[PDB]
């Protein structure tokens, strides 16, 4: 196996096609990273050559991506969050987000009271939809059956458990509270 530097001759446009993290010019394929030389043969020949470091310390979000978050504060019409994980991998820093009162459920419906959906301190799984404005920057959504709060936390510091699609209950004091439970 061989590694890369962010420029070198790799292949012709006839001997393969550019993949992820690469660029081409003057009929040649040029590297743009310092990762590893991967040639996805796939099926149909002409492998899509690409270079991947495979050790992602940081990664910029996209138009569509799954992210693990952490609520900071909640408002009657939005809920500021902090992006913590990009899908699976840990993130070295923390970005910001905002869930408007249209992205909670998968119907973009009326009602949907924000107060009992995303209580602060929880950890949720959500998907971005846009690159946002300067007020709200990433505009995340949870309009799916698989998205919502996944690992909640009790009033007094006890791991919480899902109890229904909308209700969760404390194991110690048997107290009933409202969340937006995502499928496991």
């Amino acid at each position: 196996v061989r590694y890369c530097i962010p420029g070198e001759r790799l292949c012709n446009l006839e001997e393969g096609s550019p993949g992820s993290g690469t660029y081409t010019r003057h009929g040649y394929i040029f590297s743009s990273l310092a990762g590893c030389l991967m040639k996805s043969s796939e099926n149909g020949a002409l492998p899509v050559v690409s270079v991947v470091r495979e050790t992602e310390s940081q990664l910029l979000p996209d138009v569509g991506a799954i992210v693990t978050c952490k609520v900071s504060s909640i408002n009657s019409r939005f809920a500021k969050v902090h992006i913590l994980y990009v899908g699976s991998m840990p993130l070295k820093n923390s970005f910001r987000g905002t869930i408007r009162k249209e992205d909670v459920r998968a119907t973009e419906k009326d009602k949907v009271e924000i107060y009992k959906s995303f209580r602060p301190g929880d950890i949720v799984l959500a998907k971005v939809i846009s690159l946002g404005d300067a007020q709200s920057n990433y505009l995340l959504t949870t309009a799916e059956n698989e998205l919502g709060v996944v690992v909640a936390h009790s009033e007094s510091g006890i791991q919480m458990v899902p109890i229904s699609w909308c209700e969760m209950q404390c194991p110690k004091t048997h107290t009933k509270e409202f969340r937006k439970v995502a499928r496991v």
Partner: peptide
């Protein structure tokens, strides 16, 4: 910059 995993045209 090249060792920090940012995409560049060249050194």
């Amino acid at each position: 910059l090249a060792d920090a995993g940012v995409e560049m045209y060249d050194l």
